[PDB]
């Protein structure tokens, strides 16, 4: 039971990190970043897809 208390608290922390880590306000590990394209190019259609997951 006491060990479970620690497990309970630590799973809460995991959930927290997941729904909190953000870049300037854009959440990252919550499962909303999904896939985004970074141009990394001097002309159109030269981007790469970064996929962050929940």
């Amino acid at each position: 039971v006491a060990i479970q208390e620690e497990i309970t608290a630590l799973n809460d922390e995991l959930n927290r990190i997941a729904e909190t880590t953000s870049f300037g306000g854009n959440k990252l590990l919550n499962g909303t970043f999904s896939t985004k394209s970074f141009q990394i190019g001097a002309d159109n259609g030269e981007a790469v897809m970064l996929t962050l997951k929940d």
């Binding site: 300037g24 306000g25 985004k36 141009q39 001097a42 981007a47």
Partner: protein, 54 residues
Amino acid sequence: VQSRGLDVAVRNANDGISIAQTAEGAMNETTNILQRMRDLSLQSANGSNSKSER
């Protein structure tokens, strides 16, 4: 008649190059503005930017 006319001709030509000179100058600012719009456009494409940034 030819000599006097030739003088008028030169003047008219100089005025011609003047119109073109003035017009070309405007185009020069036009492109600079267009170029900045392109650079801003690339920055907007980057996925990092949020709707607010766009």
